[PDB]
Design a protein around this motif. Sequence first.
Motif, mmCIF file in Angstrom:
data_model
loop_
_atom_site.group_PDB
_atom_site.id
_atom_site.type_symbol
_atom_site.label_atom_id
_atom_site.label_comp_id
_atom_site.label_asym_id
_atom_site.label_seq_id
_atom_site.Cartn_x
_atom_site.Cartn_y
_atom_site.Cartn_z
ATOM 1 N N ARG A 168 45.175 26.212 11.898
ATOM 2 C CA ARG A 168 44.518 25.034 12.448
ATOM 3 C C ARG A 168 45.400 23.806 12.252
ATOM 4 N NH1 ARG A 168 40.196 24.072 8.955
ATOM 5 N NH2 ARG A 168 40.960 25.825 7.705
ATOM 6 N N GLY A 169 45.249 22.829 13.139
ATOM 7 C CA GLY A 169 45.981 21.586 12.981
ATOM 8 C C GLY A 169 45.819 20.674 14.174
ATOM 9 N N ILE A 170 46.276 19.437 13.979
ATOM 10 C CA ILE A 170 46.332 18.434 15.039
ATOM 11 C C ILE A 170 47.656 18.598 15.771
ATOM 12 C CG2 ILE A 170 46.178 15.959 15.617
ATOM 13 C CD1 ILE A 170 44.840 15.547 12.816
ATOM 14 N N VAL A 171 47.616 18.535 17.101
ATOM 15 C CA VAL A 171 48.829 18.595 17.917
ATOM 16 C C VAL A 171 49.443 17.197 17.909
ATOM 17 C CG1 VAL A 171 49.852 19.287 20.116
ATOM 18 C CG2 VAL A 171 47.726 20.375 19.313
ATOM 19 N N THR A 172 50.537 17.032 17.164
ATOM 20 C CA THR A 172 51.178 15.725 17.057
ATOM 21 C C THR A 172 51.925 15.364 18.337
ATOM 22 O OG1 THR A 172 51.343 15.871 14.650
ATOM 23 C CG2 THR A 172 52.913 14.408 15.752
ATOM 24 N N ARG A 173 52.649 16.320 18.917
ATOM 25 C CA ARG A 173 53.545 16.027 20.029
ATOM 26 C C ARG A 173 53.794 17.298 20.828
ATOM 27 N NH1 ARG A 173 56.270 13.332 17.416
ATOM 28 N NH2 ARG A 173 57.600 14.844 16.336
ATOM 29 N N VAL A 174 53.947 17.141 22.144
ATOM 30 C CA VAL A 174 54.160 18.249 23.072
ATOM 31 C C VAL A 174 55.285 17.862 24.024
ATOM 32 C CG1 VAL A 174 53.073 19.918 24.623
ATOM 33 C CG2 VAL A 174 51.651 18.692 22.968
ATOM 34 N N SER A 175 56.204 18.794 24.264
ATOM 35 C CA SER A 175 57.270 18.598 25.233
ATOM 36 C C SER A 175 56.793 18.970 26.635
ATOM 37 C CB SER A 175 58.492 19.441 24.867
ATOM 38 O OG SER A 175 58.251 20.815 25.110
ATOM 39 N N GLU A 176 57.555 18.536 27.636
ATOM 40 C CA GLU A 176 57.283 18.969 28.999
ATOM 41 C C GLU A 176 57.596 20.454 29.143
ATOM 42 O OE1 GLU A 176 59.515 16.686 28.040
ATOM 43 O OE2 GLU A 176 61.258 16.540 29.366
ATOM 44 N N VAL A 177 56.944 21.097 30.110
ATOM 45 C CA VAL A 177 57.211 22.506 30.367
ATOM 46 C C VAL A 177 58.606 22.637 30.959
ATOM 47 C CG1 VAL A 177 56.482 24.558 31.674
ATOM 48 C CG2 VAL A 177 54.754 23.022 30.633
ATOM 49 N N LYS A 178 59.417 23.519 30.370
ATOM 50 C CA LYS A 178 60.798 23.766 30.754
ATOM 51 C C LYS A 178 60.992 25.247 31.068
ATOM 52 C CE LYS A 178 62.410 20.195 27.536
ATOM 53 N NZ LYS A 178 63.258 19.912 26.346
ATOM 54 N N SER A 222 43.350 25.507 17.127
ATOM 55 C CA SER A 222 43.631 26.639 16.256
ATOM 56 C C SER A 222 44.524 27.598 17.029
ATOM 57 C CB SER A 222 42.344 27.339 15.812
ATOM 58 O OG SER A 222 42.631 28.516 15.079
ATOM 59 N N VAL A 223 45.664 27.958 16.442
ATOM 60 C CA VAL A 223 46.694 28.745 17.115
ATOM 61 C C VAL A 223 46.833 30.069 16.381
ATOM 62 C CG1 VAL A 223 49.144 28.857 17.820
ATOM 63 C CG2 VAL A 223 47.883 26.679 17.927
ATOM 64 N N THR A 224 46.618 31.165 17.104
ATOM 65 C CA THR A 224 47.017 32.490 16.652
ATOM 66 C C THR A 224 48.453 32.725 17.096
ATOM 67 O OG1 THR A 224 44.733 33.242 16.940
ATOM 68 C CG2 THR A 224 46.422 34.938 16.633
ATOM 69 N N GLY A 225 49.314 33.074 16.150
ATOM 70 C CA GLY A 225 50.714 33.268 16.473
ATOM 71 C C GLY A 225 51.427 33.971 15.343
ATOM 72 N N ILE A 226 52.705 34.250 15.583
ATOM 73 C CA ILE A 226 53.559 34.963 14.639
ATOM 74 C C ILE A 226 54.459 33.933 13.974
ATOM 75 C CG2 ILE A 226 55.100 36.944 14.273
ATOM 76 C CD1 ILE A 226 54.262 38.014 17.019
#
Lengths: 620, 598, 227
Positions: free
Chosen positions: B141-151, B249-253
Amino acid sequence: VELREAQRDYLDFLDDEEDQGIYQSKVRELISDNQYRLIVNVNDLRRKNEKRANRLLNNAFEELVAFQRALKDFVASIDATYAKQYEEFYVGLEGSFGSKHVSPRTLTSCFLSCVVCVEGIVTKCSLVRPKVVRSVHYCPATKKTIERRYSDLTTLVAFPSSSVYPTKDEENNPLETEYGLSVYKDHQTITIQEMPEKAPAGQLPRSVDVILDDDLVDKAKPGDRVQVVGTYRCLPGKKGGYTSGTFRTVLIACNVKQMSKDIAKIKKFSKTRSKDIFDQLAKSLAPSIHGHDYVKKAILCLLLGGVERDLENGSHIRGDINILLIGDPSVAKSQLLRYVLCTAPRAIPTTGRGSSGVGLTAAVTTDQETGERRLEAGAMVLADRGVVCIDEFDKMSDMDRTAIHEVMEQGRVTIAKAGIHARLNARCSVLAAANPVYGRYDQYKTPMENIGLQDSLLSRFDLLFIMLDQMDPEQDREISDHVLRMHRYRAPGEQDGDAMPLGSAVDILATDDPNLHGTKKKKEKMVSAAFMKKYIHVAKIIKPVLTQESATYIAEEYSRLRSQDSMSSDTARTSPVTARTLETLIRLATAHAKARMSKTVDLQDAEEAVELVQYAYFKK
Amino acid sequence: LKDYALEKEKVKKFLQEFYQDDELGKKQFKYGNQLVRLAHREQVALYVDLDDVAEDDPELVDSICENARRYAKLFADAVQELLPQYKEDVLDVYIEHRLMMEQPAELMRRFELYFQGPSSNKPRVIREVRADSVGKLVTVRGIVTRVSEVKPKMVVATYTCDQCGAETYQPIQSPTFMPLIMCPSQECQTNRSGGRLYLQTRGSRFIKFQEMKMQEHSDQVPVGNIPRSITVLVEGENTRIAQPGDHVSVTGIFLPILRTGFRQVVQGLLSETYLEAHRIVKMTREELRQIAEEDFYEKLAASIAPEIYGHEDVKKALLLLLVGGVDRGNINICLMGDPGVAKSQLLSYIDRLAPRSQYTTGRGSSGVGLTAAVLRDSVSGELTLEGGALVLADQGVCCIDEFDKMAEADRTAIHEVMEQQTISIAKAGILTTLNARCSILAAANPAYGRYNPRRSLEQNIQLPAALLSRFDLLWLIQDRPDRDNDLRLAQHITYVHQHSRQPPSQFEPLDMKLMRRYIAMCREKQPMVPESLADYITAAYVEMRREAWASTYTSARTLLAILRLSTALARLRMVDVVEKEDVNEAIRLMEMSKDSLL
Amino acid sequence: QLYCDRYLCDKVVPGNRVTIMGIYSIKKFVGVGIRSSYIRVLGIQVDTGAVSPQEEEEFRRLAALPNVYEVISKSIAPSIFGGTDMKKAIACLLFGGSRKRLPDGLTRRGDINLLMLGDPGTAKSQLLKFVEKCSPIGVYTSGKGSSAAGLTASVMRDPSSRNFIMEGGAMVLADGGVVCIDEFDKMREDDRVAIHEAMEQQTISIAKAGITTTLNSRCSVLAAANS
DNA sequence: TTAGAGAATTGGAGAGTGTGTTTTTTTTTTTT
DNA sequence: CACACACTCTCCAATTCTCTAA
Ligand SMILES: Nc1ncnc2c1ncn2[C@@H]1O[C@H](COP(=O)(O)OP(=O)(O)NP(=O)(O)O)[C@@H](O)[C@H]1O
Ligand SMILES: Nc1ncnc2c1ncn2[C@@H]1O[C@H](COP(=O)(O)OP(=O)(O)NP(=O)(O)O)[C@@H](O)[C@H]1O
Ligand SMILES: [Mg+2]
Ligand SMILES: [Mg+2]
Ligand SMILES: [Zn+2]
């Protein structure tokens, strides 16, 4: 080739089933708690094997790998499958290490490869990052899996392995990494600094780098006073084909103890034996300082605090109590701050001219382990769930007080620097000391002109005290008598004509060895400082709740105070009574209930709290 | 040890045979249906749930959670091998032509598979993601601080040789790769033809890629610590789910970043880490009849902050602030008072109620200012714009405490917002325009002490008239003793402390979601004034200007203000034409705001 | 640049005056054929605390003889006519009181702070220049030539490491000694404010650039000023 | 007399080796 | 460090020299 004898010695030491069962019991506790380092007392190792204890403390690395292999053998004998569930079992050493107890200053180069116990204050910590110890790889072209151990100069065996993974060729076929089957360990670097008071004369405090691995990484943050047991080693800085002899040195830690953090039944009996224990604690608060009884009561309320509410609507009511002391020269304001710094857990010193808005909150600094820049906590963030003492508070710059405004108002500080945008927790009680404008308080001027601070800032303090050097002859008599008595005092463990020694290290065991009133005087049964520390440490946690009678009396007396402001003199009122004053009343009553350990804020608590508010608002 | 071929066969069995009785007992083979959709290319992403996998093999779920990347590959391979069984744009054209040549599995793969995490795994905080969880499926879990453009991220590069007319393929795994130059095919090598390779971006498989950074929730950090952060790499259909400032909340490796070259010898056995994202999850006619009750205006005004008594006309003005006038349109208002007057509490209520809003101090904040700011993120070093209270509040309302204590840069920024509702900011010496049409809700103090009515507002509050005249309503929240009201307030505060909730108020506030629905459909109405009401506006305005001249902060902006407020009340009545009550309400609200100031 | 080895380490501190015996040599890791030079120290001589027994006997005899107070007062600034009470005050400043740590942990300063306001041309600056010479640790500063950071402590970025590090001002350099602030009235008010903690609490509390400490300033302030 | 097969000399393609790679405090002058 | 300049060193084979048959 010879270390099997040492391993036999350590396995014999661990197998305590024959005589006392202490360390077999500790290993059993380790298995049950699902931990993977055993805490061993070198005093017990001395009692059973003095030779092996000396060898361990003087030949640390080889002896420690022998001890760890013996521990793995023993935990395998107790529970084999659990021994397979971890890569290796560590051993952390506690007890008394003799001459190896050092500071960062006295930790010279002759201590290399020895177990040393270093006491100091944490200045900084690097971010936790994983470190590969064994990587597992799979060959699809062969349906076979292979493994590679990894070591570096930090590891006890200390061989530097190649950093890269097997990649495109094994059996001249491409491998790929099984990250899940691989095992990684946490790695952190901290810096332990010498205690500032113990430096010799004009020397600045020195420091030593410390490396934490596996389960030790959480156990230290900046501002903590810690004792770190570990092994001291040099890291050769080769250029490749050439090196200068200058090697940096590190302390690979095997154990960390918080020496300042830390039975209740005797406290809960003492609160019944004593009559109005708040008064006795307040009188016994700073024995060296005479008078200022109401200020001492307010400081005790600051130390204990209210209870922070979270409301159903998601808003929160700040539980900390903020005190501002304004007064003449030489009326013990700085000394009260110093006592609070000595008595309270996590109390941060600060002075108005020697601090900045950056240093109070957070600073962007480069972590030299990587080169990336991160936030390094300032004073009020270090003081979270603690106290911050600000002397010469009237000497701060306005831009620096902008930082204090958010901390006092909301219990946080907002930061937007480097790559980080964040609301840091700064939930701390502020105990500020200031002189009035013109140095000395002027009776012929209104309090709002004696007090140079802005009304917006003054609204954030729960209690504001004006304390004056009134030259009454009887008050001067008692004050001077107390001062001269204090200056006449000499400690019992000191010779009749000694000058006190400048600071040097005097702690020689990882745990304190000598383990409630003052005995000299008759009047009012003064409480000892250690008992006061323990009692405040216990009493902060009680969390009492309001009652109907106390709520009714607080509301009635607040209404009286408000209506009294209708005809009260505007030229001499200390601060306007508002809902903020009501919040102060609730917090002070809650603090008094904490002092009594009552679990219910009673009418007694309301009476004392509103008496204190009456004094602070309408008495000089 | 594991026999991954047998694991693949078991995965095939699960995908073929699982059913879950969806759509009320239809016994649907959910994964068979999604396999049909993947084979037909009507679906691209397949979120297999390990809770479903647990219902026939917990050991397989454990193996997946312990070795997630391996099993992601195995699940993808099993799905690709099973798509022909259920097989009843440009890259499709290329795959067709390559099938013609047959008449590079990762290129022909035109789907993606992800593990929706099991509910038995507790969602960790970022700080609890230890090194023991590397290579394992974790929920964070967490706050999304920053997101890049889709590349576009190259997955399988495709080259064509000039001399021998052959396609060659280069699967890509690492974040960097060597582009092929000379042709490897034997007809080039044996003939020593000197043929070279040209990348064909058209016929090579890219994938959507997005880099973001999560950050700890502030109320979960330990006491003396900075919040931790984790880089999250997002691919395929997981992209564009998150936005900055969002709670996820992100499920990931949890995996290490394996850098190349000089960074390897510098870092040694240490490594940075990233979270390979698999799943991202984000944390009425009866009611309209209740709205139809003609009390609704005062019902809403009562629902606004029952914690604050009185100032009911101010609450009505605040309601019209949230409604807005005809589109200009923002009802900017300002309410001065002493410190602690319940002024901050009122502004806090509006910030909580409003759907898009911000709450800040005019002074000097060490955070991002009223304008946006440019962060650096020095591990990458790429400067990016972020935040700004006005910008974050763009479509809604921005609440400013101690407006008087603003810096001159902040005053000019608010002046620009009042003028044209956009601001200017520099990223790297170059500069852009950045959009903010928020309504301003300003709270200000006297320059010294409690307000004295003998002094005019601009001289007392110490703000320039060029800014202070912008606000449509000016209120003075003066506080003075009053015995019974003080006792009522004290009883309210004591009950709040005693029970952590507001006491019963002999009425029920309307649900804030219902208030939001109401003001939304209200704001969707678009009134217009008729000419008779324009004449009424003229008469009322000139009479009000006589009163103001005889007692001067009235101008053409006053006529526009009453027009805005009347259209706002027409929106509140949910009717597309104004009426006499609208102009009466606007006139009395302005008059009694002046009376509150007097 | 000096290189000290083994037991020469920490044999000298900043502010000390020394004679260095060593080997002038190149460092051996703008222009081309240049090498930086340094002295490999093999002998340190402090030109001016371990007293000999003979010196201890002399000091005990000096303390024992009855008119030692007048002898010290005459010995302080013998070239300065008159001002005998001021010389006695300077004697009291040089010897200082006793620091005391009380049972609650609060510490009382033993150092004596002495201000000399008065008329010009009255040997105040010369008395300061004598005390700087005579005190075991002594630092002379001009008030107008000083700054708040330079008096108490400075925070500066280490050029070779990018971290912020601490630098001792005059009051840290004079720890365990005397600070002679000449022309004390010429300081700006904000700089005179800086020494308030160090004069009484004998500490310099710092919270700047993320480094937060409490340095020691156990020193006596001798100040001179004009009307 | 002219042209093809066996032996001799030297160009250079390829393998191996060595080397190179914004953000905080403190000061100073001038702007109000 | 792993991926590029610069240099040395090795053996393959490309072209010519010389003897012979058509
Ligand atoms: N009531 C008192 N009892 C004991 N010592 C006192 C008392 N009042 C003052 N002193 C002494 O006076 C000295 C100066 O105390 P200090 O705390 O600096 O005063 P202050 O109120 O802070 N004045 P200032 O620092 O100039 O604003 C210390 O040695 C104190 O112990
Ligand atoms: N009583 C004295 N005996 C000997 N020399 C003296 C005496 N008074 C002044 N002087 C000399 O006068 C000169 C100036 O002395 P100085 O030390 O500057 O006094 P001052 O009061 O500090 N001057 P000022 O900085 O203007 O206040 C020096 O050469 C001193 O030696
Ligand atoms: Mg003081
Ligand atoms: Mg002078
Ligand atoms: Zn080709």
